[PDB]
Structure 1
Amino acid sequence: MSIMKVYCQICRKGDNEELLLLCDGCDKGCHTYCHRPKITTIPDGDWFCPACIAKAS
């Protein structure tokens, strides 16, 4: 067995799933409202977290 429950890297809670961005690079989560700067566009498709982009850049 293996269990994955997603938690937001910042506040460390899995609530508000609708505002919880799962990064498709590294599978990590972050609430839009926990982000600095805050996200006000709930992404239309795929999310790459800030850390992943600076690697991919």
Structure 2
Amino acid sequence: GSVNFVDLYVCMFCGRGNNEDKLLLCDGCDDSYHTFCLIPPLPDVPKGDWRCPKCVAEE
């Protein structure tokens, strides 16, 4: 949406001045999750379809 509200995406507690580059936002529950903080057994920056363990859990 608007880039003005892009800084509101920071990992739960974690995410300040850190790995923010590898930071993901899961469409639907999309506030924040670092690829190694809480993601599938796959911690990498994905290059395909992204969704968190919980959202993939109910499709």
Give the counterpart letter for 1:7 in structure 2. Answer: V
The alignment's TM-score, normalised by the length of structure 2, stands at 0.60
Matched length: 52
Structure with greater contact order relative to length (CA < 8 Å, sep ≥ 6): 1
Tell me the C-alpha RMSD between the 2 structures.
2.5
CA distances 1:11-50 after superposition (whole Å, capped 9, x unpaired): x2333221111112321311112136460x3100331111
Q: Runs in 1 of length 4+ with deviation above 4 angstroms?
A: none
Q: Percent identity between the aligned chains?
A: 47
Unaligned runs of 5+ in 1: none
Distance, in Å, in 2 between the alignment partners of 1:7 and 1:45 is 21
The alignment's TM-score, normalised by the length of structure 1, stands at 0.61
Unaligned runs of 5+ in 2: none
